[PDB]
Motif scaffolding. Structure first.
Motif, short mmCIF file in Angstrom:
data_model
loop_
_atom_site.label_atom_id
_atom_site.label_comp_id
_atom_site.label_asym_id
_atom_site.label_seq_id
_atom_site.Cartn_x
_atom_site.Cartn_y
_atom_site.Cartn_z
N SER A 189 2.81 14.16 -12.43
CA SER A 189 1.79 15.18 -12.65
C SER A 189 2.38 16.58 -12.47
N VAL A 220 -6.31 8.22 -6.67
CA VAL A 220 -5.18 7.49 -6.13
C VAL A 220 -5.41 7.15 -4.66
N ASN A 241 3.86 9.45 -9.39
CA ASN A 241 2.78 10.14 -10.07
C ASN A 241 2.71 11.60 -9.64
N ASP A 242 2.82 11.85 -8.33
CA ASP A 242 2.90 13.23 -7.87
C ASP A 242 4.02 13.95 -8.59
N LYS A 263 -5.39 17.81 -10.71
CA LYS A 263 -4.47 17.03 -9.89
C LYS A 263 -5.18 16.52 -8.65
N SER A 323 -6.71 -0.75 -0.80
CA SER A 323 -5.80 -1.86 -0.55
C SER A 323 -6.41 -2.82 0.47
N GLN A 373 -5.35 3.58 -2.55
CA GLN A 373 -4.64 3.22 -1.33
C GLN A 373 -5.61 2.78 -0.26
N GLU A 426 -6.84 13.37 -9.55
CA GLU A 426 -5.83 12.33 -9.43
C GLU A 426 -5.68 11.93 -7.97
N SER A 433 0.83 -1.20 0.00
CA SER A 433 0.00 0.00 0.00
C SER A 433 0.86 1.25 0.00
N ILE A 434 1.92 1.27 0.82
CA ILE A 434 2.87 2.37 0.74
C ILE A 434 3.73 2.22 -0.51
N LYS A 488 2.35 1.24 -3.21
CA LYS A 488 1.40 1.95 -4.06
C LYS A 488 1.55 3.45 -3.92
N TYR A 489 1.75 3.94 -2.70
CA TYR A 489 2.11 5.34 -2.56
C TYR A 489 3.41 5.65 -3.27
N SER A 495 2.55 6.64 -6.29
CA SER A 495 1.84 7.90 -6.12
C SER A 495 2.83 9.06 -6.08
#
Lengths: 49, 50
Positions: free
Chosen positions: A46, B42, A42-43, B35, B49, B46, B38, A32-33, A35-36, A39
């Motif tokens: 973007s 996103v 992605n941050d 954003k 999960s 999370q 997004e 999950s982190i 996945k962050y 992110s």
């Protein structure tokens, strides 16, 4: 009677199976982190755009 | 007429300048809001999960 007596388990299983079981999902590609972690990427992605 | 023609146009541009500035505010604000969607998408992932 037609009787059916199954495998009837009582599981002696330890921390290390459990520890690792958590780790691969927690730590793994799909953490999950983790996945962050994308992110943040992605941050970054973007924000550059 | 030429004077009237001119000095009117001067206000017109100034007016469009007054509109352009506010539009900058709105575009940038909107450019920021994408954003944020997004972010929500996103973040629920999370949250999603297992």
């Amino acid at each position: 009677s037609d009787v059916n007596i199954t495998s009837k388990p009582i599981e002696g299983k330890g921390i290390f199976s459990k520890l690792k079981a958590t780790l691969q999902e927690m730590t793994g590609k799909d953490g999950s982190i983790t996945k962050y972690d994308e992110s943040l990427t992605n941050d970054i992605k973007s924000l550059n755009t | 007429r030429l004077e009237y023609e001119i000095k009117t146009l001067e206000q017109v541009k100034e007016s469009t300048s007054r509109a352009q500035e506010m539009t900058q505010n709105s575009m940038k604000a909107l450019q920021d809001m994408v954003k944020l969607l997004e972010d929500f998408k996103v973040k629920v992932t999370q949250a999603a999960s297992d």
